[model samples]
Target: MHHHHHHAMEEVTIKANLIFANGSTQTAEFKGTFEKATSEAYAYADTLKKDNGEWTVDVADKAYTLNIKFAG
Candidate 1:
């Protein structure tokens, strides 16, 4: 008997509007390998809430990018 397993990684593109503490916001995008993308996304979040205080990064806007493609 033989078994096969595949572990494929891909690049992910994420986008969101970084809403600041002062009712201001801007759209941004970042691309990276699967894990990298997820990491960057969460990491970037703090940059928005740091000195600013309570804020949001909305992804509900129609203008956004979220793509996943084979890394190789």
Candidate 2:
């Protein structure tokens, strides 16, 4: 019989609050490696949209906000 070895890596969850342009809001969660959690969250958020053809996040719009948090 042979013994097996396991390696453990750091994991993190990034949480976000998506405040839309139309007075609507929702929450999003992303999980990834600790170092890239924030960037991954933003990249993921960029691909999201509402059912009415409105994008979920806008960086340049004052009314739009993507609140991100590192959920430890």
Candidate 3:
């Protein structure tokens, strides 16, 4: 029998609100990837994805990014 041992590791999550140039809004949830977890949540979150070329996401409040994603 083989069992993989695992422990707890620190992770950081960020929450962001995306407001496209077309006046459309959506919620973006960026989680800290297991391997790479140093990038700022807001940085990756600021980008908004769309079918027809979406605009950038206007950051609402970066202060809440961490809490909203993780603590919230």
Candidate 4:
């Protein structure tokens, strides 16, 4: 599957966002810019943290990886 990518030097910024859930709505004024890397062509660096972060599979691994030691 293809994922979102950002090119070096290429930048973008989100103005605002509206999220709807439950019975209420919320608005967030997001302001930021994606500065391009000053060196080698690097992309998709942030995707790893987004697609697989401590809140998802990453956390699951550590959370469930605990071993139960029993007398042999």
lDDT scores for all predictions?
0.58, 0.55, 0.45, 0.30
Task: Report how far off residue 61 is in candidate 4 (Å).
Answer: 31
Ranking by TM-score: 1, 2, 3, 4
For lDDT, the strongest prediction is 1
Tens digits of per-residue lDDT for model 4, 1-72: 423345544444332222223344333322223333211111232333454433211101111123489999
Ranking by lDDT: 1, 2, 3, 4
Clash count, one per candidate: 0, 0, 0, 1
lDDT of 3 by residue, 26-70 (tens): 665666542243244444543434343544423232332233456
Once fitted onto the true fold, the runs of candidate 3 whose alpha carbons sit more than 4 angstroms away are 1-9, 33-72
Off by over 4 Å in 4: 15-20, 31-72
List of clashing residue pairs for candidate 2: none
Once fitted onto the true fold, the runs of candidate 2 whose alpha carbons sit more than 4 angstroms away are 1-8, 48-72
TM-score of candidate 1 to 2 decimals:
0.50
**Which ten-residue region of model 3 has the weakest summed lDDT?**
57-66
Clashing pairs in 1: none
- Candidate 1 deviation (Cα RMSD): 10.2
Q: Write the per-residue lDDT of candidate 1 for residues 11-55, one digit (tens) a residue.
A: 456675676666877776777654565468767777756677764
